[PDB]
Design an enzyme around this catalytic site. Structure first.
Site, PDB file in Angstrom:
ATOM      1  N   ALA A   1       1.126  -6.829   2.981  1.00 54.38           N
ATOM      2  CA  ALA A   1       2.432  -6.615   2.360  1.00 54.38           C
ATOM      3  C   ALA A   1       2.322  -5.626   1.199  1.00 54.38           C
ATOM      4  O   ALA A   1       2.211  -5.991   0.029  1.00 54.38           O
ATOM      5  CB  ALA A   1       3.024  -7.942   1.904  1.00 54.38           C
TER       6      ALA A   1
ATOM      7  N   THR B   1       7.844  -2.930   0.783  1.00 57.62           N
ATOM      8  CA  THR B   1       8.966  -3.755   1.215  1.00 57.62           C
ATOM      9  C   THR B   1      10.002  -2.930   1.970  1.00 57.62           C
ATOM     10  O   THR B   1      10.595  -3.406   2.945  1.00 57.62           O
ATOM     11  CB  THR B   1       9.603  -4.443   0.006  1.00 57.62           C
ATOM     12  OG1 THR B   1      10.263  -3.466  -0.806  1.00 57.62           O
ATOM     13  CG2 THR B   1       8.535  -5.143  -0.822  1.00 57.62           C
TER      14      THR B   1
ATOM     15  N   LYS C   1       7.191  -1.303   6.075  1.00 52.24           N
ATOM     16  CA  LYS C   1       6.074  -2.232   6.143  1.00 52.24           C
ATOM     17  C   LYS C   1       4.783  -1.513   6.517  1.00 52.24           C
ATOM     18  O   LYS C   1       4.794  -0.480   7.195  1.00 52.24           O
ATOM     19  CB  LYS C   1       6.387  -3.338   7.147  1.00 52.24           C
ATOM     20  CG  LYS C   1       7.805  -3.882   7.011  1.00 52.24           C
ATOM     21  CD  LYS C   1       8.127  -4.928   8.063  1.00 52.24           C
ATOM     22  CE  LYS C   1       7.549  -6.283   7.696  1.00 52.24           C
ATOM     23  NZ  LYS C   1       7.893  -7.326   8.704  1.00 52.24           N
TER      24      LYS C   1
ATOM     25  N   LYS D   1       2.159   2.725   8.890  1.00 56.09           N
ATOM     26  CA  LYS D   1       3.408   2.531   8.172  1.00 56.09           C
ATOM     27  C   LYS D   1       4.539   2.624   9.184  1.00 56.09           C
ATOM     28  O   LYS D   1       4.655   3.628   9.898  1.00 56.09           O
ATOM     29  CB  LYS D   1       3.578   3.556   7.054  1.00 56.09           C
ATOM     30  CG  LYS D   1       4.608   3.138   6.016  1.00 56.09           C
ATOM     31  CD  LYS D   1       4.389   3.822   4.672  1.00 56.09           C
ATOM     32  CE  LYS D   1       5.327   3.251   3.611  1.00 56.09           C
ATOM     33  NZ  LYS D   1       5.205   3.945   2.301  1.00 56.09           N
TER      34      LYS D   1
ATOM     35  N   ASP E   1       5.555  10.582  -7.898  1.00 59.42           N
ATOM     36  CA  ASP E   1       5.169   9.193  -7.651  1.00 59.42           C
ATOM     37  C   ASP E   1       3.690   9.074  -7.989  1.00 59.42           C
ATOM     38  O   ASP E   1       2.851   9.635  -7.281  1.00 59.42           O
ATOM     39  CB  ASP E   1       5.438   8.788  -6.202  1.00 59.42           C
ATOM     40  CG  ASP E   1       5.361   7.283  -5.983  1.00 59.42           C
ATOM     41  OD1 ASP E   1       4.249   6.719  -6.047  1.00 59.42           O
ATOM     42  OD2 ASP E   1       6.419   6.665  -5.746  1.00 59.42           O
TER      43      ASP E   1
END
Lengths: 290, 194, 450, 357, 49, 98
Positions: D35, D38, D41, D59, D157
């Site tokens: 996990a 979210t 996944k 992914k 990011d």
């Protein structure tokens, strides 16, 4: 224009002329067993049928109509040139590996404009996009945007995630930057710069971008513009022409590709004469809306 | 460092202007990101507004069909002759090897292997160095002693078992150095004495 | 070409490597001196590594001095070589091709065919005990080994004659440079007749002997790239002849499926005569797959233009007394070129068609010729190579004839770099010369089918 | 004359394509749901056929969390950038597979992330990271962000979650979630994104709502990464915020002020041209405690202090780019060499990933 | 016609460096026992694709 | 032109036969047609002279001369032994059959 060398365009597409001919022959042998029937064309009942190669293949006659329809949707939606150029690149890279007698062309054009506008960071929402594709063509497009986006999914499937592509416009800006130096000290007038930009904009037809690097196409269109501006006693007068000849010679951007690009521009402007909207538009009409 | 950096260089590529100073010449279709002055001036003067560049030429997205109309009949031969002149300039200046020598019909360079003033110890070992079959060619060819009489050359050649090609090279080298020396020490140049 | 040692020229297409084994039985004391200097002159130019073979015993490497070449000794030698190959197990594929050099005790045909038989017995006894081993045959006359007047500036050529036999067979020492054109001539609107302006020609030369058995063939690109040379003993029958004429077109289309398109193969029948059975075959096999253009080729001067003038070819004043031109080079104007005569060909296109030298049933259209002068002074006949077009695909056959001659000059100039002949005929293209050498020196052996 | 949803479309080209495909049940196989994401996944992929066990990762961008929602911008930019960018310090995108509904990317599976290293050091034995390992990881991450910088592609990011490491200690900055190629911005950044990199690692240009943020925001994120790695806590562990299109992060600015100090017109030349510069005037005026905050850590002074000075500077003209930061008296001056393999001498397995089977 | 003691395989060269050393360094390239401009020895250099 | 109609290929044979017959009759009975040749019965030339007629496209009826140096030697009664008949190939003279 980060770095065209060791990019993905120089590696996994942009094959040579023999490989493109072999892939087109494999396409022809794929569509051979699909329909040997042909096309039932009716106007005056009148029903002759073409052989598999008389026309409506990917030779020349519909490519100009394809570019015209992409540019019409472009200036209707009012988005910039890089998106329509990338949409034309996706159009050619899809029609290489799939036929056109089985795929609705107008949805493919709207799908390519959608994908290129999304991937080149100038997005267009699907509502206004399919509303413009309906208000220009009231036929050949469903009201459901889901069919357009399933076309988007299969278009992403076919050109297998190789979305970004360098353009000749950046290399044209770099060439006109380097032509302002003490070795040459020249600069074009703004009308001939627009003429060179229009020739680069026009060269996305005629199947050249899948073979050569884009700086060769920029040098070819700039050479056609400069040598067609220079002449309109001595032979090679107007030394803007002389400085451009010394620039093309002294720099080792190679010949025998610029020769093919100029000859391809000449044969494109030759094939533009015997071109009419009537037969190809009626052929689309009888190929989809029978 | 441990691994080499990413300086993003080109591979083997000719720049647009080789005459320029070697660190400010733009390679074709090649532009990495570099911090400079106009970037920070844009960042300073263009906050709270958003920066985007509209293109240079007005009226983009238009085909040049009614702009360059008769590019077929009236205007092809000028393109052919101009490209012929470019091709001729290329083949005659950029690629042709210039012979910059006005003395003899050899290339520039091609010096004879230089004579060194050697005594019998190093020459005695050098002739043994030639006699093997595993030695190099460049290091041996970089020097050759002088004063070698022909009796001694042929004598040690057939006595020390020199291989055939190296022996022919040594004999031809002695021939050429004696010819060049005796053509140097010539006082009078009459028709027949040269 | 003969300056190839004195310029350190090296092949562009990479190296090929092998391991050698001389196999003599006549005079061991000279082949002992011959094999290492040939291997050393093959290593000393960058043409790969010929690490010559070495067995266990007292034999100097790359040699086996036998006597009485026969079944038992060849079987034991094959057992020795297969024991060596079982020893050297784990290696790369391209390191082990091996070849056997055999000395001809008499430079004739009767012993060339016997040395070929000996090598075939060796390959048969090696292949059944171990497959995937690939050995080759090279022959050398004994005189060239034991003549003490053989220069070491000559073995170089022999070394190139190994380099054109290694298993990358259709890549050789060099090919035509593919330069930029002289006039650009952008193809606009025509004039609009049925003119084509092709992009890539393909040359092919087949011949058939006077007795109707043998069929020889050679296939080459427009730059001398995809070379094939083959021979077929048809025999008295006529099913094997149709099979060979089908296989010729098979190999031609196999090379044709590599290029752009708008491609015109040019098949040249040797020795004048083009009979009706071959024409029926080539008319049955052809179609819209490719455009052919039949050409009749004549080598021997049946029509004999005898030259008689003293002024134009400017090697004749230098050959008349060696002092007429005789001037200094004026070495400040130093932009010259060493132009070797016997390779300065002049093209002629005749005004009217000519009859073929044999077969009075078909004349030609647009005859032409390549012509090579003799390096001498005065009135003498000049060597010639007559080309006769018979079936042009498009109109304007004179342009096709001039294009055929401009390709034939390049294919004639290639024939010295390939080991096909020495500097004796710069006017014949190389595949036609290959076909002529095969049908000159191979029809004389008689065959038995068992 | 009008069209319906039954006209001739893509339909036949589906059939000729749908006979011959390759599925995720064919080339690979599943092992266990890890996990990580979210929104999209992540799973582990055993290779379908010394032991060479499962080392792949999938992914699966199932955005419905129905009938064919299109690709998102966060998936389109990732599929455009990750397929052609390639280096030693990036995750290698092996394949794209397009199932009945959505997209399945397969990269290589990594051993652990930096967040797992901080959580291994979050037990109260307090194994403070040796300076050799953190300076080698810093050198490798800065070389990776150098390669990502110089090819004209931003990286908005940078979290310790999506920065990986592996056996042989090779740092791979493996998530191009919100990257974009900024060579020819047809539409500017504020008209295309309007929000940026996550709250705990954003830049003061972004916190003050700049509309033409420069490529130095990745350097601020890298400095926050290094301050996190030197303090074992996020340096500005900020507090989240609630007609204005921004919540302004009115507590994060207080945190980054009271750690670093106030700016003025002499450490920031053009902050007066900002949209809401007056909204910075509603805080108190702290001096700094930067050297004190480094003093409340391990004793490796005099060279991490200057680097954390230079990286954590809100002067976006005088911030320090990557290739001029890869020589800043930290890798040339050495007492143990900075290698590629960061796990030399340290002989423990920071334990494997928590796989929900 | 050179006398046959001219055609020596030359080894004493100085081209052990790299190409494109500056510009027009053909003086240390054309060294052999024939000038290369007696064959029209053209270089070949292109921008590759 | 690329394939002769069967009256020009007969006019050429008629002209060649007329030339060889007239050339044989004009000489002192010393020269026969071997078939595209005229070899003397005595060994005076010891080669084959070949007269080949042709008509060009403007109407210029020309003859081309050839001289093939084959080893065709006439034999007599003092050759009918093993030393000659063992290693020679014989030919019928006014036809050309072996």
């Amino acid at each position: 224009s980060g770095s065209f060398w060791t990019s993905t365009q120089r590696h996994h597409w942009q094959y040579t002329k023999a490989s493109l001919a072999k892939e087109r022959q494999k396409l022809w042998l794929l569509e051979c067993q699909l329909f040997p029937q042909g096309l039932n064309i009716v106007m005056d009942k009148n029903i002759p049928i073409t052989h598999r190669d008389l026309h409506y293949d990917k030779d020349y006659n519909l490519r100009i109509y394809c570019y015209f329809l992409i540019m019409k949707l472009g200036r209707r939606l009012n988005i910039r040139q890089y998106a329509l150029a990338t949409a034309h690149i996706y159009l050619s890279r899809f029609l290489i590996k799939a036929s056109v007698r089985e795929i609705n062309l107008y949805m493919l054009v709207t799908t390519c404009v959608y994908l290129a506008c999304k991937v080149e960071e100038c997005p267009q929402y699907i509502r206004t996009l399919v509303s413009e594709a309906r208000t220009l063509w009231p036929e050949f497009i469903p009201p459901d945007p889901t069919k357009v986006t399933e076309f988007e999914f299969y278009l992403l499937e076919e050109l297998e995630s190789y979305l970004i592509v360098h353009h000749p416009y950046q290399s044209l800006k770099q060439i006109v930057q380097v032509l302002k130096q003490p070795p040459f000290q020249i600069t074009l007038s703004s009308d001939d710069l627009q003429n060179c930009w229009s020739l680069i904009n026009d060269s996305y037809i005629n199947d050249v971008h899948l073979l050569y690097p884009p700086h060769i196409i920029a040098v070819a269109c700039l050479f056609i513009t400069i040598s067609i501006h220079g002449k309109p006693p001595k032979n090679s007068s107007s030394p803007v022409q002389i400085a451009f000849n010394r620039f093309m010679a002294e720099s080792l951007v190679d010949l025998e590709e610029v020769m093919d690009t100029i000859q391809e521009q000449i044969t494109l402007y030759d094939h533009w004469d015997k071109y009419h909207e009537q037969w190809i538009k009626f052929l689309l009409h009888t190929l989809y809306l029978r | 460092g441990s691994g080499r950096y990413l300086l993003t260089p080109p591979d083997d590529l000719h720049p647009y202007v080789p005459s320029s100073k070697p660190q400010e010449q733009v390679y074709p279709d090649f532009k990495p990101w570099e911090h400079t002055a106009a970037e920070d001036q844009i960042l300073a003067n263009f906050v709270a507004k958003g920066f985007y560049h509209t293109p240079m030429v007005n009226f983009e997205s238009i085909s040049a069909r009614s702009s360059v109309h008769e590019s077929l009949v009236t205007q092809s031969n000028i393109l052919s002759q101009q490209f012929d002149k470019i091709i001729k300039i290329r083949e005659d200046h950029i690629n042709k090897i210039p012979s910059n020598s006005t003395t003899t019909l050899h290339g520039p360079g091609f010096q004879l292997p230089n004579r060194i003033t050697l005594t019998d110890h190093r020459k005695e070992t050098w002739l043994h160095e030639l006699s093997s079959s595993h030695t190099s060619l460049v290091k041996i060819g970089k020097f050759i002693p002088h004063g070698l009489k022909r009796r001694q050359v042929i004598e040690q050649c057939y006595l020390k078992f020199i291989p055939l090609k190296r022996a022919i090279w040594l004999i031809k080298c002695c021939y050429f150095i004696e010819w060049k020396s005796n053509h140097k020490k010539k006082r009078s140049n009459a028709a027949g004495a040269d | 070409q003969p300056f190839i040692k004195f310029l350190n020229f090296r092949p562009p297409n990479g190296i090929k490597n092998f391991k050698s084994l001389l196999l003599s039985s006549s005079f061991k004391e000279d082949c002992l001196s011959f094999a290492p200097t040939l291997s050393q002159t093959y290593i000393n130019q960058e043409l790969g590594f010929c690490e010559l073979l070495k067995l266990t015993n007292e034999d100097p490497p790359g040699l086996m001095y036998l006597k009485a070449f026969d079944k038992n000794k060849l079987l034991l030698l094959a057992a020795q070589i297969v024991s060596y190959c079982s020893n050297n197990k784990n290696s790369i594929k391209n390191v082990p091709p091996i070849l056997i050099i055999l000395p001809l005790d008499n430079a004739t045909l009767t012993e060339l065919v016997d040395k070929a038989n000996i090598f075939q017995v060796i390959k048969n006894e090696v292949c059944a005990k171990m497959p995937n081993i690939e050995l080759y045959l090279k022959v050398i006359p004994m005189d060239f080994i034991r003549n003490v007047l053989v220069t070491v500036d000559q073995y170089v050529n022999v070394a190139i004659s190994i380099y054109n036999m290694l298993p990358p067979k259709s890549v050789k020492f060099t090919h035509i440079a593919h330069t930029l054109p002289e006039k650009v001539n952008f193809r606009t609107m025509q004039q609009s007749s049925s003119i084509i302006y092709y992009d890539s020609y393909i040359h092919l030369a087949y011949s058939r002997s006077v007795d109707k058995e043998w069929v020889f063939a050679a296939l080459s690109d427009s730059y001398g790239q995809g070379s094939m040379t083959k021979t077929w003993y048809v025999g008295n029958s006529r099913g094997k002849f149709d099979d060979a004429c089908n296989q010729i077109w098979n190999i031609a289309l196999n090379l044709a499926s590599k290029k752009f398109g708008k491609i015109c193969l040019i098949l040249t029948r040797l020795n004048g005569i083009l009979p009706d059975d071959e024409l029926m075959n080539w008319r049955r096999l052809s179609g819209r797959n490719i455009h052919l253009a039949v050409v009749c080729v004549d080598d021997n001067s049946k029509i004999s233009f005898i030259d008689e003038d003293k002024l134009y070819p400017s090697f004749k004043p230098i050959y008349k007394d060696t002092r007429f031109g005789g001037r200094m080079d004026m070495t400040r104007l130093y932009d010259y070129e060493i132009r070797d005569i016997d390779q300065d060909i002049h093209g002629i296109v005749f005004q009217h068609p000519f009859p073929l030298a044999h077969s009075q049933h078909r004349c030609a259209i647009r005859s032409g010729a390549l012509i090579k002068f003799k390096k001498c002074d005065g009135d003498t006949v000049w060597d010639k190579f007559a080309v006769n077009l018979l079936n042009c695909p498009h109109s304007d056959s004179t342009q096709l004839l001039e294009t055929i001659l401009e390709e034939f000059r390049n294919l004639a100039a290639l024939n010295v770099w390939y080991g096909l002949s020495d500097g004796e005929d710069g006017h014949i293209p190389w595949h036609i010369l290959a076909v002529k050498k095969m049908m000159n020196t191979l029809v004389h052996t008689r065959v038995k089918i068992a | 004359l009008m069209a319906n949803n039954d006209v001739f479309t893509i339909g036949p080209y589906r059939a000729r394509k749908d006979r011959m495909r390759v599925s995720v049940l064919e080339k690979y196989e599943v092992i266990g749901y890890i996990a990580a994401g979210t929104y999209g996944k992540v799973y582990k992929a055993k290779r379908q056929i010394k032991p060479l066990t499962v080392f792949y990762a999938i992914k699966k961008f199932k955005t419905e969390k129905l009938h064919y929602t299109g690709i998102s911008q966060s998936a389109c930019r990732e599929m455009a950038l990750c397929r052609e960018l390639h280096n030693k310090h990036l995750t290698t995108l092996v394949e794209i597979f397009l199932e009945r509904k959505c997209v399945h990317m397969v990269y290589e599976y990594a051993e652990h992330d930096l967040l797992q290293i901080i959580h291994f050091h979050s037990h109260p034995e307090k194994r403070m990271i040796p300076p050799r390992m953190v300076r080698s990881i810093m050198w490798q991450l800065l070389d990776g962000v150098s390669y990502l910088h110089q090819n004209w592609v931003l990286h908005r990011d940078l979290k310790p979650a999506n920065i990986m490491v592996t056996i042989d200690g090779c740092v791979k900055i493996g998530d191009l979630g919100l990257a974009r190629k900024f060579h020819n911005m047809l539409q500017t950044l504020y008209t295309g994104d309007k929000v940026v990199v996550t709250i705990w690692y954003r830049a003061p240009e972004l916190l003050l709502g700049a509309r033409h943020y420069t490529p130095a925001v990745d350097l601020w994120s890298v400095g926050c990464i290094f301050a996190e790695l030197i303090g074992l806590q996020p340096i500005f562990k900020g507090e989240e915020a609630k007609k204005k299109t921004v919540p302004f992060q009115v507590n994060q600015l207080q945190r980054i002020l009271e750690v670093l100090g106030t700016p003025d017109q002499k450490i920031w030349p053009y902050l007066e041209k900002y949209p809401e510069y007056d909204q910075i005037t509603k805080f108190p005026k702290y001096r700094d405690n930067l050297a004190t905050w480094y003093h409340s850590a391990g004793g490796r002074d005099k060279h991490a202090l200057s680097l954390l000075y230079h990286l954590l500077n809100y002067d976006p003209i005088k911030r320090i780019d990557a290739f001029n930061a890869l020589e800043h008296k930290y890798f040339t001056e050495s007492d143990i060499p900075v290698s590629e393999n960061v796990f030399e001498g340290l002989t423990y397995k920071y334990p494997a990933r928590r796989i929900h089977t | 016609s050179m006398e046959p003691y001219h055609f020596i395989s030359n080894y004493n060269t100085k081209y052990t460096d790299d190409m494109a050393t500056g510009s027009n360094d053909t003086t240390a390239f054309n060294d052999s026992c024939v000038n290369l401009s007696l064959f029209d020895a053209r270089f070949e250099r292109k921008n590759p694709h | 032109k690329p394939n002769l109609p069967p009256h020009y290929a007969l006019f050429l044979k008629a002209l060649r036969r007329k030339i060889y017959i007239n050339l044989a009759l004009g000489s002192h009975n010393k020269l026969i047609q071997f078939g595209n040749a005229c070899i003397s019965l005595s060994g005076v030339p010891n080669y084959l002279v070949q007269l080949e007629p042709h008509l060009f496209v403007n109407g210029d009826l020309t003859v081309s001369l050839c001289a093939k140096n084959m080893g065709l030697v006439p034999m007599k009664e003092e050759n009918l032994e093993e030393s000659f008949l063992s290693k020679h190939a014989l030919y019928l003279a006014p036809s050309g059959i072996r």
